[PDB]
Structure 1
Amino acid sequence: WMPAYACQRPTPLTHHNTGLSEALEILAEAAGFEGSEGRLLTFCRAASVLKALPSPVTTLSQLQGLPHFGEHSSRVVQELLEHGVCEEVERVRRSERYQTMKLFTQIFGVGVKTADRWYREGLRTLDDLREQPQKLTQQQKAGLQHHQDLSTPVLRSDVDALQQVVEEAVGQALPGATVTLTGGFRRGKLQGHDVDFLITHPKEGQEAGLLPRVMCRLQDQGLILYHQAFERSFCIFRLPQPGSWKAVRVDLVVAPVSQFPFALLGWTGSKLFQRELRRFSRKEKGLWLNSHGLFDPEQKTFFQAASEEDIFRHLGLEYLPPEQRNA
């Protein structure tokens, strides 16, 4: 009895099938690089099923009946069980296309379509991109300029220092506004690629215009290396370190308090968890979910939520705390 949607089962951060799930996730990533979003989704889902299992898979028999395992995903597990290696996964790993697409798409500002164009033009290294600067957006220029720092794990000590300076700026911009850590750190991860914060105010409407004021105040303290009426800011901060500094990606999001549970849920992830929750909402309950609200399209009304628990309840789902959303 393993439910078919990732939002229906707890997925902890530490699980028991990392070898198998990591192989399936290489095939998912490669499917994305080739423009096959459906295959990507199936391989992601199959990997996530293994993360939810209570014990290591030892025998092919233990896959029978599990959702999202068909011929292809089962063969990959079978080969890993019997041989320790899957020829398809290894061919992908070793391939110039996979390695370069991974290198390029890891850059802030570069997705699959851009990386693929560059690949087809013959580019292979970061220095190749640096050699043709006029072919870069400002966002990509910043991602490349800070690429080394942005590839360094963000630690909890960084999170805590960043939360302090964001809270200081937010408090200077709007008394009573609050700052909530979201993203992977709220799910219990000890490291990350960035830090995500959600900002609100308990009085509906007071948060109007807040994010530009927060950004100005951070910029005047020398904390901003890159930023773009707005409600989401995808920033690079100049984080002080002893005797120096490092660039860190920081996402700042403002939501009115009416939307705060929806934004908190949406920004806490995981990414697969949130896509699966929205799919469940629409396909199983007929309701439309995003980070703003939950809409009943037949009554034309929005569900009023005071908490994440309220949203799960309205969807008929057992509540999962953030640390069990690691699908």
Structure 2
Amino acid sequence: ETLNGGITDMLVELANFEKNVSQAIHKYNAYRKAASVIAKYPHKIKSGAEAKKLPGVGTKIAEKIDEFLATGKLRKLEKIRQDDTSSSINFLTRVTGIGPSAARKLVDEGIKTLEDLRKNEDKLNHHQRIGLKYFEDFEKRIPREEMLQMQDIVLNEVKKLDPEYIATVCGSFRRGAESSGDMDVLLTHPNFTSESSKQPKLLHRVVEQLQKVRFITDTLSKGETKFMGVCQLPSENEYPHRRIDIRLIPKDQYYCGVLYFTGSDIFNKNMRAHALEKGFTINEYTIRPLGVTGVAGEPLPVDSEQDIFDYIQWRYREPKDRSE
């Protein structure tokens, strides 16, 4: 239905821009009032020309009206899809090394595109570099065949080390996705408990090792609890590079830890609440009793995922079964 409808709509966004983007209460109000005006209006506006005759509808409008009435868009308007530098923010974000401010800066350097950065290697740091340098694979979703493949390796490898190590790959993959994005590996081992000292070498041993065997190509952040890095499959005739993060957790927290990293923000969200629901407070580290007034704690013993559920009384929603 509604004939003038197109023009009117166009008129709104155009108006909303000038108010929010700038200060001009005058331009907005205007663009604003024209809308008003044309809608009140009942005949299919054939051309802004005519339109001009109309009240509030000034010389300007018409043009913009007619331009729009012409090309199913407006040039002044078109700035929308571009957002200039702001598009770039999110673009840049895609890169691995870049974060909010970090990103903010490159663009304003003139570094909006990958292309810039391709030169400005320096303007970056080792993280930023890497990200770039392999960006592409970075966006090439993984496959379960692969996945399992890399999967096995890790879990296995660790074993070569000391079998009292617990590997677990989490993330989408666990839920049984057919396309995971990264390898979120959680790791642990009885020596390290929440009472334990900072145990770097643990997690470390293994990393270096993955690195040893050449499953690892670069280290994004060797830290003490966490390790971010890259891997890639073994060759013959090659498979891209994939992310991987080796997380190290205390054996007495590793569970919720798992449950959490297991899956779906929703389900977690759902889950977090239900406990709360039944008087339990839950987060990535523990399940604790929710006392009087909302504040209270003293986390219970956990040896397995069921242990959580049970507290918070739930039929086991298997991994697969967790998208909500």
Q: Aligned equivalents of 1:142 and 1:270: distance in 2? A: 28
Q: Aligned equivalents of 2:88 and 2:207: distance in 1? A: 34
* Deviation per residue, 1:95-115 (Å, 9 max, x gap): 555642332112122223333
Indicate the residue corresponding to 1:34 in structure 2: none
Q: Aligned equivalents of 2:264 and 2:81: distance in 1? A: 24
- Is residue 2:130 matched to residue 1:142? yes
Q: Which has the larger radius of gyration?
A: 2
Q: Aligned equivalents of 2:104 and 2:90: distance in 1? A: 10
* Deviation per residue, 1:87-130 (Å, 9 max, x gap): xxx99766555642332112122223333333344322111112
* Deviation per residue, 1:138-164 (Å, 9 max, x gap): 211111111112111111122122122
Confirm or deny: 8 A CA contact 1:236 1:248 kept in the other structure: yes
* Deviation per residue, 1:183-236 (Å, 9 max, x gap): 0111121112212222234x4549953211001111222222222272221111
Give the aligned residue type for 1:134. Answer: D
Q: Aligned equivalents of 1:151 and 1:180: distance in 2? A: 24
TM-score by length of 2: 0.62
Using the TM superposition, give the Cα deviation of residue 288 of structure 1 relative to its aligned residue in structure 2, in angstroms. 4.8
Q: Aligned equivalents of 1:187 and 1:99: distance in 2? A: 33
Q: 2:94 aligns with which of 88, 106, 115?
A: 106
Map 1:266-277 onto structure 2 (within 5 A).
Answer: 266-274=260-268, 277=271
- Is residue 2:291 matched to residue 1:311? no
Map 1:37-186 onto structure 2 (within 5 A).
Answer: 95-96=83-84, 99-186=87-174
Alignment RMSD: 3.2
Using the TM superposition, give the Cα deviation of residue 276 of structure 1 relative to its aligned residue in structure 2, in angstroms. 5.8
- Answer 1 or 2: higher relative contact order, Cα 8 Å, separation at least 6: 1
* Deviation per residue, 1:37-59 (Å, 9 max, x gap): xxxxxxxxxxxxxxxxxxxxxxx
Q: Aligned equivalents of 1:92 and 1:112: distance in 2? A: 21
SS in 1 for 2:98: coil
Q: Aligned equivalents of 2:108 and 2:276: distance in 1? A: 38
Indicate the residue corresponding to 1:200 in structure 2: 188
SS in 2 for 1:183: coil
Indicate the residue corresponding to 1:212 in structure 2: 204
Distance 1:303 1:281, change over 3 A: farther
Using the TM superposition, give the Cα deviation of residue 271 of structure 1 relative to its aligned residue in structure 2, in angstroms. 3.6
TM-score by length of 1: 0.61
Q: Aligned equivalents of 2:104 and 2:275: distance in 1? A: 32
Distance 1:172 1:310, change over 3 A: same
Q: 1:255 aligns with which of 246, 249, 259?
A: 249
Indicate the residue corresponding to 1:243 in structure 2: 237
Confirm or deny: 8 A CA contact 2:110 2:116 kept in the other structure: no
Q: Aligned equivalents of 1:277 and 1:192: distance in 2? A: 22
Indicate the residue corresponding to 2:217 in structure 1: 225
SS in 2 for 1:186: coil
Distance 1:143 1:286, change over 3 A: farther
SS in 2 for 1:104: helix
Using the TM superposition, give the Cα deviation of residue 294 of structure 1 relative to its aligned residue in structure 2, in angstroms. 2.4
Using the TM superposition, give the Cα deviation of residue 302 of structure 1 relative to its aligned residue in structure 2, in angstroms. 1.1
SS in 2 for 1:325: coil
Distance 1:316 1:150, change over 3 A: same
SS in 2 for 1:301: coil
Confirm or deny: 8 A CA contact 2:276 2:282 kept in the other structure: no
Give the aligned residue type for 2:241. Answer: A
Using the TM superposition, give the Cα deviation of residue 167 of structure 1 relative to its aligned residue in structure 2, in angstroms. 2.2
Confirm or deny: 8 A CA contact 1:180 1:199 kept in the other structure: yes
Aligned length: 236
Indicate the residue corresponding to 2:179 in structure 1: 191
Unmatched tracts of structure 2, length 5 or more = 1-77
Indicate the residue corresponding to 2:258 in structure 1: 264
